[PDB]
Amino acid sequence: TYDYLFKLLLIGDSGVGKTCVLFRFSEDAFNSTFISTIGIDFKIRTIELDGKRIKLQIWDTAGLERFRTITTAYYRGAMGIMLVYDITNEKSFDNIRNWIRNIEEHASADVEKMILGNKCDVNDKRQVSKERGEKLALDYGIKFMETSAKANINVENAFFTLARDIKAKMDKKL
Amino acid sequence: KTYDYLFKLLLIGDSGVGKTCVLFRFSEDAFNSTFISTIGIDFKIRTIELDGKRIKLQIWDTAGLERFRTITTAYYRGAMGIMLVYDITNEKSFDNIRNWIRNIEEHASADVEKMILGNKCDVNDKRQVSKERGEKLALDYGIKFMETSAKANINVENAFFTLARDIKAKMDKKLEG
Amino acid sequence: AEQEKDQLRTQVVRLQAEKADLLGIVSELQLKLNS
Amino acid sequence: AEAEQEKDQLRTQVVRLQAEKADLLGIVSELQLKLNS
Ligand SMILES: Nc1nc2c(ncn2[C@@H]2O[C@H](COP(=O)(O)OP(=O)(O)OP(=O)(O)O)[C@@H](O)[C@H]2O)c(=O)[nH]1
Ligand SMILES: Nc1nc2c(ncn2[C@@H]2O[C@H](COP(=O)(O)OP(=O)(O)OP(=O)(O)O)[C@@H](O)[C@H]2O)c(=O)[nH]1
Numbered sequence A: 001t002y003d004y005l006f007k008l009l010l011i012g013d014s015g016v017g018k019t020c021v022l023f024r025f026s027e028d029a030f031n032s033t034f035i036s037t038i039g040i041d042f043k044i045r046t047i048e049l050d051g052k053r054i055k056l057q058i059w060d061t062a063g064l065e066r067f068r069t070i071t072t073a074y075y076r077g078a079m080g081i082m083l084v085y086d087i088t089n090e091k092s093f094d095n096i097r098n099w100i101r102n103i104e105e106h107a108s109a110d111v112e113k114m115i116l117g118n119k120c121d122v123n124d125k126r127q128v129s130k131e132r133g134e135k136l137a138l139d140y141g142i143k144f145m146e147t148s149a150k151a152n153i154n155v156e157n158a159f160f161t162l163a164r165d166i167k168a169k170m171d172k173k174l
Numbered sequence B: 001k002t003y004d005y006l007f008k009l010l011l012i013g014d015s016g017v018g019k020t021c022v023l024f025r026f027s028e029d030a031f032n033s034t035f036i037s038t039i040g041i042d043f044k045i046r047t048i049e050l051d052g053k054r055i056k057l058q059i060w061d062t063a064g065l066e067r068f069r070t071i072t073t074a075y076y077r078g079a080m081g082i083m084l085v086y087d088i089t090n091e092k093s094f095d096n097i098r099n100w101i102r103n104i105e106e107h108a109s110a111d112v113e114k115m116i117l118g119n120k121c122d123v124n125d126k127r128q129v130s131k132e133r134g135e136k137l138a139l140d141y142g143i144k145f146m147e148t149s150a151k152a153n154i155n156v157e158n159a160f161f162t163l164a165r166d167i168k169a170k171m172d173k174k175l176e177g
Numbered sequence C: 001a002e003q004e005k006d007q008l009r010t011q012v013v014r015l016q017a018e019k020a021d022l023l024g025i026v027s028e029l030q031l032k033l034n035s
Numbered sequence D: 001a002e003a004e005q006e007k008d009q010l011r012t013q014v015v016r017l018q019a020e021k022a023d024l025l026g027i028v029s030e031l032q033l034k035l036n037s
């Protein structure tokens, strides 16, 4: 049923769109009604890379601090982590540095990482320039893109790229 | 939380005796004859009412094959009731109930509620284990007994409601002190 | 062609509840390993 | 003033949820072995 199996997480502040980004990836849909994640949610999608079947087990964490202990235990064993902020919400962007510390303190040293500046369709309420997002990511040597679950921008590209990077690192070891 | 009580139940017994079919009948009020052996474990929820209170049953349907013994036995701890299922058309499955009871006693709590189900009682012609023998085995162990049929829908509701009642009564008596 | 709309909806509701419980169980098991 | 989802859509939802359930059950089973339940 699959050639590789990759564990992915999405982390970042409550409300930035982690569930919507995954919902767009998982089922090509968007719903604007906010239902904050209770602790954790889970989805499966199998993609193909280099003619091989890649099964993605994707864990969608709650962003609220009340769930930190529950969500943090999923970091061990993760092979790729999406760090998500909301381009209309400067504080969610500022918090990315704290989220990276949480990764570095709990996940594998070589876990693959990617930063997503989500809600890039709401340019009329933007608080974080694309340039500052690219710079933060450059400061940490992490890949970066702006996404929109609602308009379906860079969501496919985010996961396929993360998955490609995980696979290349795996393949290099053989 | 919709519910007032929460009971973890297990079904155990030899492969092919009908544990999954008994649960499917309780869960979804249907029966399918095509055998699909359970891979490790399956899981079903059903909420019933006893004494005007809402009883959520978390029901774990274990694989019977010995290849899955390690996986399935780790579910024993914390179970509050266990169905021990054999197949009235299959004497070996009945003979093995005593081994399943030993597996319960070695891994579950001392006061776990237990019940023996003699399943496929609709297949009267190919019966290998008389009802009297099933009743006597149960009597030897002080455990409740019923003959059931997932297919003809005999005693499936009765079995789960009785086990739940016995669990609930044990808890209530404990609470009141 | 014997499944019907309401049976299917009920199936979805049932699996969604099973999923919710299972996710709770994974989360708690993971915390018990983490000590 | 909003649409019933189709049963084709319902059929797909069930398949997706069953596959999720199968993985989670496997994950629960392996975690319990690590704890020595
Ligand atoms: N315009 C626009 N709104 C979005 C987008 N993504 C999410 N939203 C909105 O932002 C709200 C929050 O989205 P969620 O995915 O639930 O946020 P979350 O990160 O999963 O929040 P928690 O589960 O609490 O951690 C949603 O109700 C949507 O209305 C997007 O790409 N564009
Ligand atoms: N006539 C009749 N057949 C039954 C009954 N219950 C189960 N069967 C059949 O017996 C076979 C085994 O049923 P299952 O429920 O899959 O058995 P199981 O105990 O769950 O087997 P494992 O998962 O391998 O442990 C299936 O072909 C069912 O159709 C019953 O009450 N009456």
Ligand SMILES: [Mg+2]
Residues within 6 Å of the ligand: A018, A019, A020, A035, A036, A037, A060, A061, A062
């Ligand atoms: Mg969410």
Ligand SMILES: [Mg+2]
Residues within 6 Å of the ligand: B019, B020, B021, B036, B037, B038, B061, B062, B063
């Ligand atoms: Mg079975």
